[PDB]
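Slack export, channel: ligand-projects

TW: morning all. Re-posting the request from yesterday since it got buried. We need the structure predicted with the small molecule present, not the apo form. The ligand is chloride ion; the SMILES is in the block with the sequence. No rush, but it would help planning for next week.
GE: picking it up
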Amino acid sequence: MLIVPYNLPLPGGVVPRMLITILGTVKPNANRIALDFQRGNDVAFHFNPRFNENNRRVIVCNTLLDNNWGREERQSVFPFESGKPFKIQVLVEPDHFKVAVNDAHLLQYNHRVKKLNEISKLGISGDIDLTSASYTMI
Ligand SMILES: CC(=O)N[C@H]1[C@H](O[C@H]2[C@@H](O)[C@@H](CO)O[C@@H](O[C@H]3[C@H](O)[C@@H](O)[C@H](O)O[C@@H]3CO)[C@@H]2O)O[C@H](CO)[C@@H](O)[C@@H]1O[C@@H]1O[C@H](CO)[C@H](O)[C@H](O)[C@H]1O
Ligand SMILES: [Cl-]
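GE: finished. pasting the full token output, ligand included:
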């Protein structure tokens, strides 16, 4: 088991064909999960499943630049379940991050941060038991 929050270095940043795989289990009564792809203090891609926002479940995605959050992108398709094992795959493509959960396509997030090779950390945080976090080039 990994300790959360967990930092995964992404050496030399991200690049198309880089596949990041996160395995874990959502805690019972979870409130949130966050994946934060970081460029220094900025968050190039924030992926934030929320389990109770006004008693609804929603994934919020955004970018943090100079400590300001941008315009949120919201997805109501919500494949996570409290208590249950999940797999998140983030595949870097030329124009977006492409996210699949449990082998099903979920969403894409267009690159707002252009310096992919400076997005050199992934923070994994929130209400999970984290089993593994890794990357490979496909
Ligand atoms: C309060 C909180 O949860 N802080 C988190 C931070 O959460 C923000 C993001 O999810 C953004 C993405 O757009 O939304 C913010 O809420 C919006 C909300 O969606 C809007 O409807 C509303 O109108 O505005 C608010 C705020 O603009 C969330 O507050 O996400 C970051 C990245 O994961 C977290 O780091 C932060 O938690 C803090 O992290 C610190 C270390 O990084 C410390 O752990 C600190 O104690 C945490 O509170
Ligand atoms: Cl940039």
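GE: first-pass observations. The pocket of chloride ion (ligand 2) is lined by residues 113-115 (CB under 6 Å). The radius of gyration is 14 Å.
TW: perfect, thank you
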